[PDB]
Structures are given as structure tokens and as C-alpha cells.
Amino acid sequence: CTELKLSDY
Amino acid sequence: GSHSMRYFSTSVSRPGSGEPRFIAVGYVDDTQFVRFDSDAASQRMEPRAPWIEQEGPEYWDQETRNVKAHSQTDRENLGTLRGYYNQSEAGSHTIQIMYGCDVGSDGRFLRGYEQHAYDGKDYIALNEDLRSWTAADMAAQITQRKWEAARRAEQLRAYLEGTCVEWLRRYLENGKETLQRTDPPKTHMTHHPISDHEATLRCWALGFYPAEITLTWQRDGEDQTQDTELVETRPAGDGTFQKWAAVVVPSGEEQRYTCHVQHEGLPKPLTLRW
Amino acid sequence: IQRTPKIQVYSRHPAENGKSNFLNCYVSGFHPSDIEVDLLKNGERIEKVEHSDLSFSKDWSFYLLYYTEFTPTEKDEYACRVNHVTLSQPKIVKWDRDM
């Protein structure tokens, strides 16, 4: 399963 | 037998419209199990291995929501990086991310990863300690400082050491009859006369899983690397892999050249000759 | 920024005339991701060709497998054609049963 969210650069 | 789970994602800007192409794939070891493609009609995460089909609607809903959020973050980040690097809107650019985790034979956490690239070059990555970042340039260090201030590493480490490992364990059990198999290579040698002076030997490994393998040549008992060729390991399309290694030798002297094959599925390495 | 594709064209199983098989073209090591890959039979594009989902290697270069079912014969010549921004003309690699 995936990360819940990534993050802004 | 350690194991890995990896997610690979690629977003590509399309100047003519403004909607990037986003493709994500998930793997356990060398076996793909899910995909998402923004160009596809479903707009959902899709299964690509039989053993993921038993997951219920809540799995597909959550994975789809997560991967769509990832695509939107990439979309915003394409604009942000255009700004950091002073690039125009005319060109296409690419963001790639790989993340995931490794477990040991006991199913416990070994290593975690999250690495980002822009236009095919390193941008920022989580370090092995899961507590610090490696930025490739000063633009990436803007991101690093943001993630440092937000304490992103602690949240990512929780995923890598928790969610990632527990789901890898679930997949390995649900798909154990295929994921925990080893298929040893089937090997053979071919031979092609070139001239009155030269001939080619080609050593073959076919039908093996996982993909990791080593093919080496020896001449009279010592490793032989001059005049050799080794192709990249390649998928057969049925879940197994293939590789070959070749050497040019003096015609008639083939007996001196042994091919050595190392693979996890072999009790001991194989040696073979023409 | 740009990396030219490597190309291998090969069958899934050892080729035997009259026996159903799969013809594969594995392209790798390329960047950017847009690429054209076709399998040719006697110089003509095969219509039913599928491909894997785009992924990439440690060095960030992309790879794809294109494939079709086929039954090899004595007379039929097969090849893989690749077009990419790095190529001044399409690259055509002929299938050799021992490669």
C-alpha cells in the first residue's frame, strides 16, 4: 500500500 | 530471503494542455501488482497480480485516493520546479519518485527509501537513517528546509517502518505460492564460428525468478572479462527473466572457457561449456 | 538530459517453427519517457502489440516491454522498431533466434 500523501517542494 | 516493496511514479508535463501524464506502479520484489495511469479511462488503481484481487472496495478506494493525491502533488510540484529553475512553460519536464521498504526473512524492517528526481537527475532523497535529507542543489535545499521545518522525515519514517512493512508482509502471505518461489535458470551454450581464427560462445540463462543473477566467464580457471559481452537482464513476459553472456575465443579453444551461473534458486552455481 | 534507448528483441520461449510463442521488444535506458516501439513482421507493423506500464531503473532511465503472441516460421522476418527524440532516424533491430 501507498503513502497517504507526498509533500510539496 | 529478504523482500522489497516499491512504488515508482512518473509525472510528465504536457505544455499543450496543462494536465500532466501520471503513471504509478507498485512492485513486490520483481513482480508488479498495481498500476495507475491518468490517461486510462478507469481513473482508479488497477490490479496487476492475481493475489491483489482479494482486496476489498476499501483497499481500492483508499489506494486510488492516495495515488490521485500523489498525482496532484506532482502537478503542483512541476510548477514549483519550473519556478525554482527559471524554466518556461514551453518545455515538457518530468518528476520521478521511488519509495518503499525492504524486510528480512523474519518479516522485520530492514531499509526504507524515498528518492525524487527532476528531468532524470537527482533532486532530493531521504537518507538511510530515515532522519535526514540529501539535496542535489540549492533548489532542492529549499525543499529540504521546508521538510525539515515541517518534520516530514518523522512522518515518512512511520510509513516506511510501519505501514510499508506490514502491507509487504500481507502481500507476501496472500501471494506466497508465487512470490516466495524461486525458479532456477535453465542454462545452455550456443556456438557460432566467425572465421578461421575466431568463434563466439554464448551462455544462456532462461526462465528464472527473481531477476538477480550473475553470469561470469573463466578462461583456464581465472575470470575472463576481455572480449566479453553481457546483456541486461530482461523479462520473458511470463514473470520470469532471461540473460546471456558471450565471449569471442580462438576457434578450437572453446574448452578453455567456462560459463558460471549464480542464482538464488540454485543449490550451487552451475558451470557449463560448449 | 536525454538518453538513447537500448533495445533487445527476443522470444519468450525458444523458437520452434509452427509453435505459438511471444515476441518481445525490451527497451531501456532512455529519457525522456515518450517513445514509439513497434514489432514488425516482414517490415510491417504488427497490430496487436501490448506493453508494460512505464517504470524506471536506479539511474532514473525508463524501461518498457512490448510484446505480441506469434508463431515463428521459416520465412517470416521479425524486428523491433524504436523512435525517440534522441534518434535521428528510427532504430530497427532484427530478431535473431539466438540473441
Numbering used by the authors:
A (entry chain C): 1 to 9
B (entry chain A): 1 to 274
C (entry chain B): 1 to 99
Task: List sentences from the manuscript.
The major histocompatibility complex (MHC), also known as the human leukocyte antigen (HLA) system in humans, plays a pivotal role in activating T-cell immune responses by presenting antigen peptides on antigen-presenting cells (APCs). HLA-A*30:01 and HLA-A*30:03 differ from one another only by five amino acids, three of which are located in the PBG. In this study, we determined the peptide presentation features of HLA-A*30:01 and HLA-A*30:03 through a series of structural and functional investigations. To explore the structural basis of the different peptide-binding characteristics of HLA-A*30:01 and HLA-A*30:03, we determined the structures of HLA-A*30:01/RT313, HLA-A*30:03/RT313, HLA-A*30:03/NP44, and HLA-A*30:03/MTB at 1.5, 2, 1.4, and 1.6 Å, respectively.
In contrast, NP44 could bind HLA-A*30:03 but not HLA-A*30:01 in vitro. We also found that NP44, which was an A1 supertype allele, HLA-A*01:01-restricted peptide, could also be presented by HLA-A*30:03, but not by HLA-A*30:01 (17). Furthermore, in the structure of HLA-A*30:03/NP44, additional water molecules can help the PΩ-Tyr of peptide NP44 bind to Asp74 and Asn77 in an α helix, to enable stable peptide binding, quite similar as in the structure of HLA-A*01:01/ NP44. Alignment analysis of NP44 presented by HLA-A*01:01 and HLA-A*30:03 showed a similar overall conformation of the presented peptides in the PBGs of the two alleles. However, the side chain of P3-Glu, P5-Lys, and P7-Ser point to different orientations in HLA-A*01:01/NP44 and HLA-A*30:03/NP44, respectively. Further analysis revealed that Arg152 of HLA-A*30:03 formed a salt bridge with P3-Glu. However, no hydrogen bond was seen between Leu156 and P7-Ser in HLA-A*30:03. Even though the PΩ-Tyr side chain of NP44 could form a hydrogen bond with both the positively charged His116 in HLA-A*30:03 and the negatively charged Asp116 in HLA-A*01:01, the hydrogen bond networks of residue 114, 116, and the PΩ-Tyr of NP44 were different. In HLA-A*30:03, the negatively charged Glu114 could form a salt bridge with the positively charged His116 and Arg152. Mutant HLA-A*30:03N77D lost the ability to bind with NP44, whereas HLA-A*30:01D77N bound NP44 with high capacity.
